[PDB]
Amino acid sequence: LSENVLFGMGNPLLDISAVVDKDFLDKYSLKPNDQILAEDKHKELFDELVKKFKVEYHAGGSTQNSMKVAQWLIQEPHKAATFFGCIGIDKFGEILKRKAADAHVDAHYYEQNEQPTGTCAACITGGNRSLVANLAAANCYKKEKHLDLERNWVLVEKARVYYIAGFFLTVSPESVLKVARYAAENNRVFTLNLSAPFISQFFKEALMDVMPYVDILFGNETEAATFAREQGFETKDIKEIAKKAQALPKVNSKRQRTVIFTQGRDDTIVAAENDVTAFPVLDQNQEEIIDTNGAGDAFVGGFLSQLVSDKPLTECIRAGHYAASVIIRRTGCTFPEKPDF
Numbered sequence: 001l002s003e004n005v006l007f008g009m010g011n012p013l014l015d016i017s018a019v020v021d022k023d024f025l026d027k028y029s030l031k032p033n034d035q036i037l038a039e040d041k042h043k044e045l046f047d048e049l050v051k052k053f054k055v056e057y058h059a060g061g062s063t064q065n066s067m068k069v070a071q072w073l074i075q076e077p078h079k080a081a082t083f084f085g086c087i088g089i090d091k092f093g094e095i096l097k098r099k100a101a102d103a104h105v106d107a108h109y110y111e112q113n114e115q116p117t118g119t120c121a122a123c124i125t126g127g128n129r130s131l132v133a134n135l136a137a138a139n140c141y142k143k144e145k146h147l148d149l150e151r152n153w154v155l156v157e158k159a160r161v162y163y164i165a166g167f168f169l170t171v172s173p174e175s176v177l178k179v180a181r182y183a184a185e186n187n188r189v190f191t192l193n194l195s196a197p198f199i200s201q202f203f204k205e206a207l208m209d210v211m212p213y214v215d216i217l218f219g220n221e222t223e224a225a226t227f228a229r230e231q232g233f234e235t236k237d238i239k240e241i242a243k244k245a246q247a248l249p250k251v252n253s254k255r256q257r258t259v260i261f262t263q264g265r266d267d268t269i270v271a272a273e274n275d276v277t278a279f280p281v282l283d284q285n286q287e288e289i290i291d292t293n294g295a296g297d298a299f300v301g302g303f304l305s306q307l308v309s310d311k312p313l314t315e316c317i318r319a320g321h322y323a324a325s326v327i328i329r330r331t332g333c334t335f336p337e338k339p340d341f
């Protein structure tokens with residue numbers, strides 16, 4: 001593989017992670033398994049987390065996590081995976097830079113000095129993770145001042161595979177579209193996550209603007225169900241949702257869309273190759289689970305590590321299941337130094 005063969009961009013966040021209780025979730029009107037954007041009522045949540053819960057700080061952000069997981073499984077060369085996004089000039093920013101370097105990703109941040117680096121409260125209860133994202137600097141990403149510069153754009157031009165989490169549609173749909181159109185015009189593979197229910201609910205115009213450029217769509221079962229509802233697809237069958245998403249208007253007709261929905265411990269659903277297939281999750285030992293935060297990002301990273309080396313679908317899924325199995329045994333979207341795949 002070459003350097004910069006995989007490209008992502010997104011919201012670089014520092015995760016502030018801790019095991020909480022139902023009470024804590026309930027006083028902040030938080031679902032046990034959800035992802036939301038921070039509101040004013042959530043400023044006290046972050047303070048309370050750090051004062052009374054056993055917080056760990058780990059690099060996060062959905063696309064950043066998948067770029068790191070991908071790199072991890074690739075191993076060599078270093079800098080196979082590129083990541084762009086915006087941070088502040090602060091301690092949390094410095095942490096994110098260090099962890100990107102440690103992960104051997106080619107990270108190029110837009111740094112600005114007004115907003116702090118973005119953070120995400122990762123509130124863990126049993127097999128559940130409730131995420132509250134305070135994007136801050138991540139929301140200040142400027143296409144015209146970063147992606148569009150030739151010294152950055154050349155890295156985009158080096159990639160065979162692109163991945164952007166749907167989360168980034170809340171920040172820069174224009175960036176997403178520029179990369180997607182580039183991918184389509186060059187018959188490269190562009191990939192995207194549904195990310196969270198709120199993306200289908202509140203950012204559906206931007207989502208449906210990018211959808212025609214999507215060669216592989218990722219998501220979980222709850223995200224799929226929401227996307228279906230918000231498109232008027234009524235079905236009691238996740239396989240049908242994946243088929244319907246597969247058949248959406250597509251600009252690059254030379255590649256068929258592939259749609260892949262994970263379902264936690266239930267089977268991963270893949271619409272591809274004129275069929276829909278369920279791939280079981282063979283790792284079912286619930287007693288070893290530490291924290292499911294990052295499971296789906298690790299699944300994507302695992303999948304992408306194999307995709308860039310032209311591996312078969314089965315092996316792509318296998319690597320995504322393996323990476324998720326490692327990540328759910330640790331705090332945050334973290335991993336040991338080496339894979340065992």
Ligand SMILES: Nc1ncnc2c1ncn2[C@@H]1O[C@H](COP(=O)(O)OP(=O)(O)O)[C@@H](O)[C@H]1O
Nearest residue numbers: 220262263264265281283294295296299321324
């Ligand atoms: N409780 C679990 N038991 C075993 N594997 C799990 C569990 N939760 C997640 N995983 C693994 O992580 C993958 C993605 O998890 P999922 O919960 O669907 O995604 P997300 O993190 O996007 O909500 C699953 O396909 C599976 O490989």
Ligand SMILES: Nc1ncnc2c1ncn2[C@@H]1O[C@H](CO)[C@@H](O)[C@H]1O
Nearest residue numbers: 011013060061062120131133167294
């Ligand atoms: N709005 C968001 N944008 C980008 N990443 C997010 C957002 N909300 C949560 N995440 C990330 O999702 C990861 C878990 O999938 C966490 O590491 C967290 O940082």
Ligand SMILES: [Cl-]
Nearest residue numbers: 010011063165
């Ligand atoms: Cl992201």
Ligand SMILES: [K+]
Nearest residue numbers: 291327330332
């Ligand atoms: K985890």
Ligand SMILES: [Mg+2]
Nearest residue numbers: 127264292295
């Ligand atoms: Mg889960």
Ligand SMILES: [Mg+2]
Nearest residue numbers: 195220296297
């Ligand atoms: Mg997810």
